[PDB]
Amino acid sequence: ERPTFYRQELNKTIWEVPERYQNLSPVGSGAYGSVCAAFDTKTGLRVAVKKLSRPFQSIIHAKRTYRELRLLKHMKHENVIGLLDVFTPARSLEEFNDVYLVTHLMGADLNNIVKCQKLTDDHVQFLIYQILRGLKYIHSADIIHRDLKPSNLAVNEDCELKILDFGLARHTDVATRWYRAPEIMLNWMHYNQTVDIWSVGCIMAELLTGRTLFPGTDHIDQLKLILRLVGTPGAELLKKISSESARNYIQSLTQMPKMNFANVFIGANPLAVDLLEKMLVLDSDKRITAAQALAHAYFAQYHDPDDEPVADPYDQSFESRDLLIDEWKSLTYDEVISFVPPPLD
Numbered sequence: 001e002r003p004t005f006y007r008q009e010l011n012k013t014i015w016e017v018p019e020r021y022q023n024l025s026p027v028g029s030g031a032y033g034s035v036c037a038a039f040d041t042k043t044g045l046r047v048a049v050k051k052l053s054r055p056f057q058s059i060i061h062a063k064r065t066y067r068e069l070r071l072l073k074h075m076k077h078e079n080v081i082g083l084l085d086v087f088t089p090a091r092s093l094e095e096f097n098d099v100y101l102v103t104h105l106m107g108a109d110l111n112n113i114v115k116c117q118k119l120t121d122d123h124v125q126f127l128i129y130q131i132l133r134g135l136k137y138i139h140s141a142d143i144i145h146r147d148l149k150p151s152n153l154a155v156n157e158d159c160e161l162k163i164l165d166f167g168l169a170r171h172t173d174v175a176t177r178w179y180r181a182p183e184i185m186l187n188w189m190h191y192n193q194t195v196d197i198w199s200v201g202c203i204m205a206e207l208l209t210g211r212t213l214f215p216g217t218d219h220i221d222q223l224k225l226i227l228r229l230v231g232t233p234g235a236e237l238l239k240k241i242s243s244e245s246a247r248n249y250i251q252s253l254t255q256m257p258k259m260n261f262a263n264v265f266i267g268a269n270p271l272a273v274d275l276l277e278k279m280l281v282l283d284s285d286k287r288i289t290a291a292q293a294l295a296h297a298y299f300a301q302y303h304d305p306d307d308e309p310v311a312d313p314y315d316q317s318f319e320s321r322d323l324l325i326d327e328w329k330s331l332t333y334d335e336v337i338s339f340v341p342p343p344l345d
């Protein structure tokens with residue numbers, strides 16, 4: 001049953017993977033692990049293999065490992081990262097120290113294919129459609145991404161797109177704040193799912209114009225540039241702000257009106273402009289949802305209400321728990337062992 005493993009060293013780190021994975025080649029890394037391209041001899045497809053970095057170093061790393069594995073085991077949608085395989089070279093819990101995750105290799109992300117460049121209107125429709133199709137699914141399981149940015153959006157040669165949990169922050173050969181909802185930067189501590197729609201708006205704008213929509217130098221500059229486009233908060237939004245200091249500061253600003261978006265995005269498909277107007281609203285309760293956005297006329301050539309599925313319910317109850325490092329490790333180990341690969345279809 002247990003496959004036979006082999007060892008090699010890659011960028012000062014040891015990789016121990018089953019023989020089925022061949023021609024490991026680094027493609028990059030992030031805060032939580034390093035990623036290699038490989039050939040999967042079982043399917044004949046190319047895969048991405050992520051080795052998590054120091055998965056059980058602290059209580060927080062351990063819980064973060066468990067969270068990532070539990071999440072990735074639940075995602076089963078064409079526009080969301082899915083797990084082909086999860087393995088460890090350990091034969092038992094006592095020696096369990098390394099965790100590797102496997103997904104379909106995409107080969108690029110939207111940090112790249114922007115090229116700092118204009119994409120055509122039809123390419124924008126298709127890419128933003130797939131993003132929203134993925135988010136409808138994610139949001140239906142009451143998961144909010146919260147950190148959407150071009151690097152989270154993996155794209156293959158067919159322009160097929162998947163949302164990653166974490167992309168490559170470094171590529172073996174773009175500020176995150178640029179894509180953040182204003183409520184995130186104000187530390188609201190309670191979020192709507194439409195925090196992610198804000199980010200989509202930012203990405204859609206950039207693809208249509210070739211320019212970063214709000215290239216702030218910091219969170220304060222970021223908000224300054226946002227208010228410039230969308231205007232200062234209205235009385236209706238103001239009613240909903242409990243924070244006295246946030247309210248007092250906002251009300252003390254030289255008040256500004258919402259710009260005419262048609263003027264800002266001159267030349268763009270008016271349907272795209274209309275959709276941008278419905279994503280980029282300060283008040284998160286008035287932003288369009290992923291489900292509503294799919295049914296916007298902009299996506300008429302793609303929208304299929306019978307092929308935009310929702311997710312099985314997802315149990316996030318472990319988030320409220322405070323466990324020992326060996327308990328998170330053991331729970332993660334149980335998840336490695338219970339893993340059922342998808343069919344080769």
Ligand SMILES: Nc1ccccc1Nc1ccc(C(=O)c2ccccc2)cc1
Nearest residue numbers: 027048050101103105106107108109166
């Ligand atoms: N997050 C995670 C979880 C489990 C396994 C892997 C990952 N992470 C990635 C998945 C796919 C890719 C790419 O296909 C890619 C993107 C940009 C450039 C080259 C290739 C990159 C990272």
Ligand SMILES: CCCCCCCCO[C@@H]1O[C@H](CO)[C@@H](O)[C@H](O)[C@H]1O
Nearest residue numbers: 075081138144145146147163164165
């Ligand atoms: C599979 C697609 C859904 C992915 C949902 C989780 C995306 C990552 O979630 C991010 O994790 C970070 C580190 O833990 C946190 O600091 C961020 O607040 C959070 O947005």
Ligand SMILES: CCCCCCCCO[C@@H]1O[C@H](CO)[C@@H](O)[C@H](O)[C@H]1O
Nearest residue numbers: 182183188190191192240282283284
């Ligand atoms: C310059 C600062 C203005 C930013 C105002 C952001 C308002 C975001 O919108 C708020 O989102 C909350 C969820 O986080 C909801 O609870 C509120 O009902 C909603 O109005």
